[PDB]
Amino acid sequence: IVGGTASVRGEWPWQVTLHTTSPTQRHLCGGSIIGNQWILTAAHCFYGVESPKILRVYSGILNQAEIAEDTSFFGVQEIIIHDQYKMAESGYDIALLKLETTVNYADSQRPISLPSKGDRNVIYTDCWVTGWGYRKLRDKIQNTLQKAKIPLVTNEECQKRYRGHKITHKMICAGYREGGKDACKGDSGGPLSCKHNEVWHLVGITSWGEGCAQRERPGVYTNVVEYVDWILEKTQ
Numbered sequence: 001i002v003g004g005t006a007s008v009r010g011e012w013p014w015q016v017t018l019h020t021t022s023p024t025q026r027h028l029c030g031g032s033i034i035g036n037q038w039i040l041t042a043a044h045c046f047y048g049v050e051s052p053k054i055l056r057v058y059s060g061i062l063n064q065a066e067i068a069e070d071t072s073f074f075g076v077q078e079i080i081i082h083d084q085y086k087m088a089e090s091g092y093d094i095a096l097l098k099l100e101t102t103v104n105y106a107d108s109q110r111p112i113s114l115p116s117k118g119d120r121n122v123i124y125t126d127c128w129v130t131g132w133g134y135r136k137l138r139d140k141i142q143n144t145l146q147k148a149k150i151p152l153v154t155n156e157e158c159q160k161r162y163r164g165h166k167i168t169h170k171m172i173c174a175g176y177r178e179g180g181k182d183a184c185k186g187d188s189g190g191p192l193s194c195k196h197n198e199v200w201h202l203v204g205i206t207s208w209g210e211g212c213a214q215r216e217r218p219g220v221y222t223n224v225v226e227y228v229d230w231i232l233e234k235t236q
């Protein structure tokens with residue numbers, strides 16, 4: 001997260017850190033608890049991941065230093081990638097992780113509500129992007145989870161910024177004209193959370209962008225409300 005600040009312990013309880021064990025253990029992607037056995041993440045995260053066996057999901061984490069060999073984690077039983085996905089930039093950048101065991105909800109780890117089809121005309125003004133990613137383009141994974149308030153840009157405005165791409169209705173963009181605040185390497189799969197009527201909604205999944213926090217380049221997120229039927233179908 002560029003131009004962000006440290007989160008407080010448990011202020012983003014749906015936020016998970018997805019690790020890989022191959023060749024040595026490292027953070028791979030962010031993700032969100034959407035159910036007892038369900039993590040919503042991005043599809044691009046699993047490029048070259050042959051088996052869900054190398055994956056470890058960690059919940060209730062503030063700092064990466066909390067993860068040692070003796071730390072409990074959730075095994076992955078299945079990676080469900082959307083069947084129309086090819087790559088991040090063309091959309092359908094969504095994946096569900098079926099956990100081996102269920103998550104015991106507490107103040108440190110709880111699910112985030114998915115937006116309803118009626119909320120398609122809601123004007124979200126309290127949107128945050130969270131992750132352990134890069135604080136600059138050339139950096140490293142951060143110990144402490146960062147947060148940044150980012151305003152939603154219209155699909156019409158985002159399209160003018162990405163003239164060589166098609167920004168579809170299944171995408172949502174967020175950013176400042178002048179830049180300085182955005183997701184960066186290591187934040188993908190993660191939530192774009194928006195507070196509406198005292199309730200937090202998973203509005204977007206960190207997907208792609210041209211660099212990180214550049215002027216006139218909003219970050220591009222998967223628009224979750226467009227996948228609530230696919231989420232229902234695959235979670236059955």
Ligand SMILES: N=C(N)NCCCNC(=O)[C@H](Cc1ccccc1)NC(=O)c1ccc2[nH]c(=O)cc(O)c2c1
Pocket residue numbers: 026027028029044045133140141182183184185186187188206207208209210211212213218219220
């Ligand atoms: N402006 C925007 N909104 N951009 C959004 C998209 C940002 N892209 C990402 O997050 C990529 C995607 C991606 C995710 C997984 C694999 C390839 C690409 N992540 C990484 O490269 C990434 C991820 C984990 C890492 N683990 C480490 O230990 C050291 C790393 O260097 C490191 C870097």
